[PDB]
Amino acid sequence: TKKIDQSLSKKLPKGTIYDPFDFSMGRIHLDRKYQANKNSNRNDIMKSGANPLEFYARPRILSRYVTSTGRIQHRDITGLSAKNQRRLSKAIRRCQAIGLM
Amino acid sequence: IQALEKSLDELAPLMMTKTFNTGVAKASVIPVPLNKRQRNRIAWNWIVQSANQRVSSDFAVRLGEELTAIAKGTSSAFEKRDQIHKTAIAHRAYIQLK
Amino acid sequence: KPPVYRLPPLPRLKVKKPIIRQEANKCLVLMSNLLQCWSSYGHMSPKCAGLVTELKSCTSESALGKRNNVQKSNINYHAARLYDRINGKPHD
């Protein structure tokens, strides 16, 4: 067979430097273990400094912090500060009461 | 001797399903592999049972006749093997593989 | 910022059932393939000839092959050896 699963091969980006270890299975496993959604902050409005309570009339943004059924995600998952989690939950509950979410 | 080994290698089932009393619930019928010594036992017992249906008073004669028929293709024990392999193919998903 | 959770002083640092990677038996995977080969191409089909030959060799002497991969985890030996050093406990 001339085919390998993507999970068993690492694609080295262009312009990056590499070591011989980057072709091993250890690199594959190490990349899985340390795979965190750290790029969310730059794409996370609520981790930028905006007040989540100003989005109570924008269900599309709020729908990014609820599950498929509408359950607000725990702070352990959202990664927000205590204040933003508190404000975000209020925004979602207010949005639900207005009839938008 | 070569005829005997060829007959034993064709008649013995490669695998056999066994019931394992695992858990308080119903036992699981999981296909199990067989080694060559275990395969020969299964095939030999089938041969002896077929041999003992023949008319000769001498077991050697009945065994000889049975072995000659098996070496010539005709044997009623090939049905037994096909029925043991059918069951195993049905329970292929029950295998554990770890 | 990621919340670090610090444990209280503990009588032990131990994994109840250390996980081990148990490589699959080569004879059982061969049997699982042969059984599948018969399910598609049929029982005794000439397409599964190689599978039958390989299975016979794998199980010829031992029906599970030469199982020589038994392993035990050492996490509990290291965990108990290093706990006092790395727990960050204040001085006495």
Partner: peptide
């Protein structure tokens, strides 16, 4: 890199065969 790519070849093949058996289930 060859030394590493040789071990990687073996494991890939092994893990692309366990998947085939496990997936067959």
């Amino acid at each position: 890199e060859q030394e590493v790519l040789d071990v990687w070849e073996k494991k890939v093949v092994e893990e692309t065969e366990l998947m085939a058996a496990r997936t067959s289930n």
